[PDB]
Amino acid sequence: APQIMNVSARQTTSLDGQWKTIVDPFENGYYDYRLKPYDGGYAQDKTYSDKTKLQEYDFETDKLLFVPGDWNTQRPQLYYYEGTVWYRKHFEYSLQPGKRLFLNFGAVNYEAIVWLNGKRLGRHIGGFTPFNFEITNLLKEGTNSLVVKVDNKRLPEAVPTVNADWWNFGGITRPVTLIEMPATYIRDYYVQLAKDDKNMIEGWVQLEGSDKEQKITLDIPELKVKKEVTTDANGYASFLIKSKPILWTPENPKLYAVNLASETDKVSDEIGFRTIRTEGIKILLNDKEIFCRGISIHEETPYYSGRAYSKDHAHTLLSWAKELGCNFVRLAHYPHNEEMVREAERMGFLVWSEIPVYWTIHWENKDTYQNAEQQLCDMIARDKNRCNIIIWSIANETPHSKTRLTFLSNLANKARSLDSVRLIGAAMEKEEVQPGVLTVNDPLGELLDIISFNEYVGWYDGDSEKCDRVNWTFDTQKPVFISELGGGALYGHHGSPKERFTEEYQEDLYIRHVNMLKRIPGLAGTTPWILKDFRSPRRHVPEIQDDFNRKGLVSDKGQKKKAFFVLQKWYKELTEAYK
Amino acid sequence: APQIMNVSARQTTSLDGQWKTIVDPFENGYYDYRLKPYDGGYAQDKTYSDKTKLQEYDFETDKLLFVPGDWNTQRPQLYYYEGTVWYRKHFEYSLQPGKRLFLNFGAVNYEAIVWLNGKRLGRHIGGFTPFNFEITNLLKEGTNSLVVKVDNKRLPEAVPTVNADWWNFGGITRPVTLIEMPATYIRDYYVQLAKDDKNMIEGWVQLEGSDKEQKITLDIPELKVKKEVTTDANGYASFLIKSKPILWTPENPKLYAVNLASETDKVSDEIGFRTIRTEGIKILLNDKEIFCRGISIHEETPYYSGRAYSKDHAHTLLSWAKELGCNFVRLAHYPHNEEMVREAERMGFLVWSEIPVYWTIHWENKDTYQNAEQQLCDMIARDKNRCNIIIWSIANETPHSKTRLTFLSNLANKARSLDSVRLIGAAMEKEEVQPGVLTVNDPLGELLDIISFNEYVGWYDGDSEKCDRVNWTFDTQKPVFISELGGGALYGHHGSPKERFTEEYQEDLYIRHVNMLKRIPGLAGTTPWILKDFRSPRRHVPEIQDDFNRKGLVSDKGQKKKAFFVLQKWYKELTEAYK
Amino acid sequence: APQIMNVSARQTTSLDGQWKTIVDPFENGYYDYRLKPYDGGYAQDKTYSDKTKLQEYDFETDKLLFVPGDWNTQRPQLYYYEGTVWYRKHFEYSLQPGKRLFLNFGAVNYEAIVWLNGKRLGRHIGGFTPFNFEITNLLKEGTNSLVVKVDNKRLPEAVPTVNADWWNFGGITRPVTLIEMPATYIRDYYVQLAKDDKNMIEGWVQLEGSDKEQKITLDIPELKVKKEVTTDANGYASFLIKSKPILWTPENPKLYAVNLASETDKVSDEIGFRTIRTEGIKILLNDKEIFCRGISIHEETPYYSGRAYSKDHAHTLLSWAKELGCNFVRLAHYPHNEEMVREAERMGFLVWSEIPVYWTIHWENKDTYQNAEQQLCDMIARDKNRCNIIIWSIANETPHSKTRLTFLSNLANKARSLDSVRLIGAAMEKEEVQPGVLTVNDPLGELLDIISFNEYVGWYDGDSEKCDRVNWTFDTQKPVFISELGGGALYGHHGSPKERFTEEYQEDLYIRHVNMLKRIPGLAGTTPWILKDFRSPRRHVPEIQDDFNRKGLVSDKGQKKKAFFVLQKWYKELTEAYK
Ligand SMILES: O=C(O)[C@H]1OC(=O)[C@H](O)[C@@H](O)[C@@H]1O
Ligand SMILES: O=C(O)[C@H]1OC(=O)[C@H](O)[C@@H](O)[C@@H]1O
Ligand SMILES: O=C(O)[C@H]1OC(=O)[C@H](O)[C@@H](O)[C@@H]1O
Ligand SMILES: [Cl-]
Ligand SMILES: [Cl-]
Ligand SMILES: [Cl-]
């Protein structure tokens, strides 16, 4: 049940493919007509072979869905579907006596309940974080039955809550993986530069199993590092290593082969090293002032606009951001699949990583907070060794209230207790305190390392001309980071620059908006909204939006709109200026 | 806002056809990103003509839906859809000064919010009862804008609640009608035999408007009845008329032309006269002992299985019940459209009329009770002059608890206060107190005129053989009425009589079940479940159920299964026996 | 092999329900990659149990379609589908040796190839006529396999050809029925009044089998008719019977029970008696001058607009025609299912019955002619005992050419050789010889008993005003019969009477058109186009047509448009005038 670090480097076997499925809007497979749990629900996966008896379902003859994937793009009937879909997989696995076996879900939105061979393994909430179950002693010989009850109903108390500006993609949205482990295994580990220290690698390792006291070697061959330690009675060891690694940058995204070997287990990784801090209004990477030439990205695929999960999806999306001139991507509004973060790391993109504490979260609900903090912990735990991540984001466009501030302050404190190195951010919002004077007056700012916020001057707030007659002031010397900006346009839809949703309007907006950006004191980064048009049930203009947010600089079909080249040109200028 | 009696006989103009629609799962047209109501939502029906400004919707270029109808069968994407769909209609109407105009909805499931020309008229809950709004002084010249926000999300506190065995058909499911009235009009009236009195017609009439004190004439030309009264200061008058009408029966469903004429209004109706009472275990129609040779029917169409609304739909369904040998139909589990009740009345079918107080209603919720009692009142108010209705049903398969009993007792008392003539029923459930001994031990029975209940011996409770080894006893001498019984089968699916869901199993079940029925003391009626296969999201056997309850004696494609003729044969015997 | 009269009255077993199907556009199940027919294709119906061998199909685990029905309305993917769909059904049947068994198809559009237990039974072309195969010797014990390859590709040489104004509904569109016969059975018979004779019933009976020479008795008990004859060695016998039947009329559609008994077979029927002839410009029914107050009707269902096949469908459609005031229905453009003709027979509608010799048939193709003549023969053979049919129509809107005239003259001669009683028609077209003067100048008229033609003054030919100013003349004294007229409208779409496709334009058109009809010399009948909106792939106005011909006086959803009441009022007047 605890998280497993670096699943892809383990002895893995995929369960992906096409699974049997039952769409169950009234949850008949779980509740009887008295609304009570009952024995003989769909978790038993009883093939309906003996028709002298009555049952009301049969996985064996029902329809398939692809796993991994959202269900919404797989059948017209499931486009809007919010509720329960049952998934069922049969598999065999020969597990040598003494070896251990874990079932890992990359993500399931939103609620997953999991059974193996009719026995409940457990339950998960949160649609974008991984979870696993040990099945070592539950695996049978011959056919095993895996049943997953997936529900994506929107809940007021959930994280996210009943309103958000993206599609409610339900299903087993990321790979399902069997992981074989030795009886005592390296479960988790951390290897990164010490805070603000180009010359000191620090880290720790955590074993799980009955043989917790072991010698461990941390091996970084290219650095001629070979450090041996011994774990304590809890299976834990730490280390400090003086070294001079070549530091990762967007221009040279250097990664090192890192090998961990205990007496009973071994795992290899690719890990880069960098320092990150603010100094006044400056963002310093490896002690050098940088500008975050960024773009925002949802976890949604080119062309068919389903939930992204593969290296293919990531490489295409990031290849567009590369052509745009970016050294930075904001992955909104939740943890993305690990392939996306890894491809950003290898290709040279700094990353903003976020949890979906989005809009009107139930700040007074203690279960809601525990959910948000669990997603925070899981986000950091999975990716703590990804040096390209420099900002953890704890919220996006949340309304001001005392309970909200308390909620978010506790998340910010928790984040810092988990990771003293990376910057803490959150998408705040702007105000126009007096005509023409724009600022960010949000008490949340005091808990953040950057003045990060969304603003839509020239789209939601005025026509494009308004960019020309506003200026920005901030009452603190922290780097200013505009985490969203921009406007909508349909690729191939042309007209006057005054006509909204034409490419020409969006282009004119970006020209005047960039001019405004150039006047902002302390500006250190921009991640305009957004790289690719994406699905949203709040975008209803027929033939223009058609259930897509159209603020992409690239269409959902991979076409660069006119405004793409306005931002590209400015990012080219910023690249030269920050050399 | 008060109900209008006999809408079809008024000066009516249809608004049916195809309306503009916006599917809005996150209710963006109603709530902003702070989850607050906002000015400029979709109720304003602003055509998106000026694209120099931003808006996120446009009825004028969006997709159509048919009105009336469920949305589920109209688009694959809407099959399972639970949530909000906006409907918009433009119309003109020339209303002579001084005349009044009402907007009548036959039904909208589940919640309707209605605007005219951007102004909210009001809101309705309950998916099967009519409601109207006066628009006399809101109608403009030229184009008028009617916007209806329809939501069919299942609510725990709603009536019905989050679980039921039929499809959640959302939409404007019955005709939308403009009704023109004189300035003071006959709004409501009642004309029926006095309780247990073949020779006394009683009734009342209710005017609405400023000229409430008027002479009124009740005219029944075939009976040579011409009774003149005067209304009181509240617009109310009553009457008692000694007369010898030919009494309505299933064999001779006699209706009389009834004309009401006040000084300012007039309306004609077709009304029949009959007495109905129990005497011990006997049901007496016009003092004659009858058997209710019935069949249950959902409000769902032949062939395409959408929500039924027209005389065409009713005539086809009732023509099947006629061929089956029925003199009675149970219209489950909610008030059906008025065309169905009228066609039953004209063709000669006694009727059981029901409200959807079904399964796990929230008995302790005072809003829930007020909803249930309002639906009860509206059900009786619409159809109080339909002499073929002899049973009002207040519940179906509700679990035993003190709060439930209090809830249902209040409904039963309310029903009797509204209608002293018709019988009060409810589908109770059976118990097997000792092996082979079946009875109905439910305290609700004390408040009902009949021992009405569902039982599924040979389908849910045992195989068909169990019918042969059980018997029934009842501790009170009230007529026994089995409101559901039977089993499932796919038309065209054949095999051994031991194989469930074959026609042969269903046939064998009905043979043994009818033999069991013939042994029941006090049996006075049966409405087996069901006439036609119907949609249910709780029926998941692939290729057999496919989201249909298969307990029809007729398939959803109009095909008579083998079991149809078993019940037909018994009903033929009962017809002879009760001559 | 030959047609069987009155299938419904035989010992029938339905094979309807849901069948396994395979969509096969490239006909992989029939042709190999050299485009050669191969054996081992899909007609073998080999369940794919042994996966150590290679096979490219499996009926056993493939998708279902309803039989009977078009495929087009059953799946979105099959909406436009033109090509091959394979259908498969398993059944058991116990046949006592000596008894015979036939497989009857009410209709399959367009080409059907049929196999039983892997052996080809034969082939049929023509989408609207029934066909039979004897399977007496091919029936096996246990599971029998019936496979039908159905193809509705449009062919230039087909009847109809590659262009027509209705949907290409493919599939097994009418019931599939097993018919058990004695070894020598009554295959066909004819019982009708002799030409122009109110007192002489003439007829013949045709036996089939090895004992064709038998005593036959024809009983009409209500008429006290008992006639015994003996068939010849060819199985044939004729009879002449003096009687005085009550003559069938639309107002009193009298039918008699007719019983035929041979030594080894017997069959009952319901048959009515009437005379029909022209007299100058008069049509006389039972010697009485009548007007054919008609409406045209396609074989398409109310509400969901699939292919009609059942008594339910027929009754709904014809109940609309009854309310419209019709005594006559034109069933276009092909033979309708037998339920429609029988319901028109019992409800009191005279019938025009037609074969799809429509538009640009290949007049020079000898196979095309034999196909048309076979459909003619089959149409008349099936319904020759339906006294409500008074017109056989051999064509609709065919271009004038010498070869077309020869083709149609041969059909007309064949029709007359098969039926000396009923009238011969065909939908001709009009022309404007001189400005403002319309007539029918088609040499086909010489071969018809009526001057029957389609005209669209006010819709295709001018605006509605043109109806007010044109005059008509005809150079022969045969009854004039307008077989189509009218215009399109969307129900619920209102505007100026000058705006085409509004109900008001259509209403204004019918008012002016009806007045035009009153001055057409010789007019004896009208069947306006059309009763119900119907599917056509030539009707592309979005939101108005949406792939429907909108010329219905009733919408596809059963709603009477304004123009319905214009024609109803004229038919009310004609009913009084012709009393
Ligand atoms: O409105 C928009 O387009 C975007 O604006 C925002 O500030 C939201 O954070 C983002 O999720 C929306 O998609
Ligand atoms: O289970 C069934 O088929 C039926 O049984 C019942 O008792 C319910 O009242 C009915 O709504 C269900 O459809
Ligand atoms: O154009 C029309 O609406 C109709 O006109 C005709 O003359 C055709 O015979 C008919 O099949 C078409 O549907
Ligand atoms: Cl947008
Ligand atoms: Cl069922
Ligand atoms: Cl049209």
mmCIF file of C-alpha atoms in Angstrom, chain B residues 195 197 204 213 231 295 340 401 406 426 453:
data_model
loop_
_atom_site.group_PDB
_atom_site.id
_atom_site.type_symbol
_atom_site.label_atom_id
_atom_site.label_comp_id
_atom_site.label_asym_id
_atom_site.label_seq_id
_atom_site.Cartn_x
_atom_site.Cartn_y
_atom_site.Cartn_z
ATOM 1 C CA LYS B 195 -70.170 7.491 -2.871
ATOM 2 C CA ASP B 197 -75.028 6.047 -4.878
ATOM 3 C CA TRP B 204 -68.468 21.412 -7.761
ATOM 4 C CA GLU B 213 -69.851 35.500 -8.533
ATOM 5 C CA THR B 231 -70.879 30.678 -7.209
ATOM 6 C CA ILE B 295 -51.513 -6.019 -16.522
ATOM 7 C CA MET B 340 -53.093 7.068 -21.577
ATOM 8 C CA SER B 401 -39.917 1.448 9.609
ATOM 9 C CA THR B 406 -46.024 7.663 9.549
ATOM 10 C CA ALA B 426 -49.923 0.391 -2.307
ATOM 11 C CA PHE B 453 -48.541 -6.548 -2.935
#
